[PDB]
Paper text:
As scaffold for implementing fold-switched allosteric assemblies, we chose chymotrypsin inhibitor 2 (CI2) from barley seeds. The small (<70 residues) globular single-domain CI2 is a paradigm of two-state folding in which a sturdy native structure unfolds at an extremely slow rate via an all-or-none transition. The CI2 native structure contains a four-stranded β-sheet and one α-helix connecting strands 1 and 2. The C-terminal β-strand is inserted in antiparallel fashion into the sheet’s middle, breaking an otherwise parallel arrangement to form a unique fold that is specific to this family of serine protease inhibitors.
To identify possible spatial arrangements for assembly, we analyzed the crystal lattice of CI2 by X-ray crystallography. CI2 crystallizes in the hexagonal space group P622 in all the conditions we attempted that rendered crystals. On the lattice, the protein forms double hexameric rings in which the two rings are packed head to head and rotated by ~30°. This spatial arrangement is strongly predefined by symmetry, and thus we identify the toroidal D6 particles of the crystal as the target for engineering a CI2 assembly. The lattice also reveals that inter-monomer contacts are few and feeble, both between ring neighbors and across rings (left), explaining why the protein is monomeric at all conditions outside the crystal. Indeed, crystals obtained using salt as primary precipitant follow the standard arrangement of early structural work on CI241 (left), whereas crystals grown with PEG feature domain-swapped dimers arranged in the same lattice structure and group symmetry (right). In solution, we find that CI2 is monomeric at concentrations up to the millimolar range and remains monomeric even after unfolding partially at high temperatures.
Numbering used by the authors:
A (entry chain A), B (entry chain A), C (entry chain A), D (entry chain A), E (entry chain A), F (entry chain A), ...: 2 to 66
The structure:
């Protein structure tokens, strides 16, 4: 059971999300982007993109990639 | 009768919208985005996106998702 | 004859536009957006979107919807 | 109670959708478009856009506009 | 009173639209495009774009331009 | 445990996907779209969009919505 | 000979452009937008859109519309 | 006076447009594209793009570039 | 050394690409899409998207995801 | 002097373009796409994309990449 | 040999780029835009668009147009 | 073995990325852009685009081009 998504983080702050993700995935390379940002298709097993809203809350389920 | 949309909130401030939505749906995870922002198709029964205008008023009918 | 568009407001300030629209349509729910913003297809008989330019002047004919 | 949306038509054929909509709204001007097509913001009280999928089934809730 | 828009043509066939527009504006240069097509901002007093749906019916109000 | 996604269907034909989804969710309203198609944010608990590739194989994880 | 475009204004400031356009077209309704902004197809004989760059210089030929 | 645009060709067929352009600009490299197609910013003094509609009529003013 | 990309397949046919990929990754779920198609960010360790050109040749480096 | 662009091929057929490019760059991996197609930023020293128009003529300067 | 592109300016500041371009093309009308900005197809022999990055460095080869 | 990509820089600051890239490629012309920015297809063997997130960390694998 590999932890690959954090549905429990939707609506939480980016600071709380970073803390949780690094506890579950200490190698995570955390990227913080506005919702709607276009990204590439290249997969990175250690990257976790956090898509944030106007108040810097997690707006979409974080996933590895 | 499940409360899934708030047409009565269009034109209201984000503060008033948050207060109303949390009264009707105490588990709501409220996300605040500019109008026009592209989002994912993943459904979250407890998320309510608020799409706001230049004056932080609700610009589209809030819906669960 | 239902007032549904304000061609006379193009180039006017948002403050003047709001004043005129509310005189003609006292129930108007006025939304202020940058020109070019993508919106939904849902119709709201009482909403009037004002699309503004860099100087907060009305850039497109306001219409109900 | 004005009939303005047909959630019951999602997944149905365009022929069945047209028949139902014209029964409920005999003045309907029915437009048939692929899902994802960009449209204008102009409101037409008698227009009903049907957004269809690859098999010509209704893919989104038809609404007046 | 210059005829610049044909709201009465929404939902009609392109053949019927062409016939009506040329009666009202004999100099019209009629262009037939799919709904959603991006066009330029250049204005042509004699051009009338007809935006058509999957069944070649007029999907948006024809306007001069 | 509500069945809301079918990761096991990626790469399978649309016919096989429809058969599996209707077994798991007999009320499913199945919509078949090309990959990349833009859709609305409205949630439909009984809709399952199938996004297909050039060979009509499932290209993305089907999800309810 | 109707003045409908100002190629001579490309690269000039918005202040200088406004002054020239109003001399040539005293009824002009001047709209100031960033380059690349999407606009509507509706034609307004008295509107002149000025598309400006990062330094508020005219980046495209102003035209009536 | 360099011939750089053919407003007189809007609404004409691509065959008639090609004939006229090659008479005025015998070195023209004529490219035929659907309206709305995105192109590059590279300038080619001898290229003339013809943007055509559903009936292969010229939909926008041809220009050199 | 996990095989995750096939730069050697650019320009090859989709049939040859499928044969090579399945030799290197027998569990591959092969998806065939036109170049430029927008996809989701969800990662699937067993999916390989093949982006093809007008002649069904591989146009971009296939990668797992 | 490395041959990296073929401005002389604009307006020529794809067959003639392929013949010329392979004479100048025998290792070329030739990709044929419609004008306007979005591609990735990954550089391939041996790939040459040919962007073609409705008549399969070269519409943009071919370049290596 | 007409100077129409400045590959040597990529990565340089906008101030240095302006100085070089005006030395080579004293009539240049210099426009400064963010990378990615959509522009029109109209050609202006004296315009040079500078597309800049987050640090106001030249991000793409300046070209006349 | 030509150094053309820096997967090890994902998640690192732009300052650290610049230092590493210039050590490996002293001729690098470093461009700093927001994630999602559209760029041209022109290849520059000495350019390295750094796509950064809201916190100015490298969000995508830097590559030459």
């Amino acid at each position: 059971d590999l932890k690959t998504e954090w549905p429990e983080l939707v609506g939480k702050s980016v600071e709380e999300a970073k803390k949780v993700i690094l506890q579950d995935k200490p190698e995570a390379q955390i990227i913080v982007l506005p919702v709607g940002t276009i990204v590439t298709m290249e997969y990175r097993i250690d990257r976790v993109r956090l898509f944030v809203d106007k108040l810097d809350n997690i707006a979409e389920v974080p996933r590895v990639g």
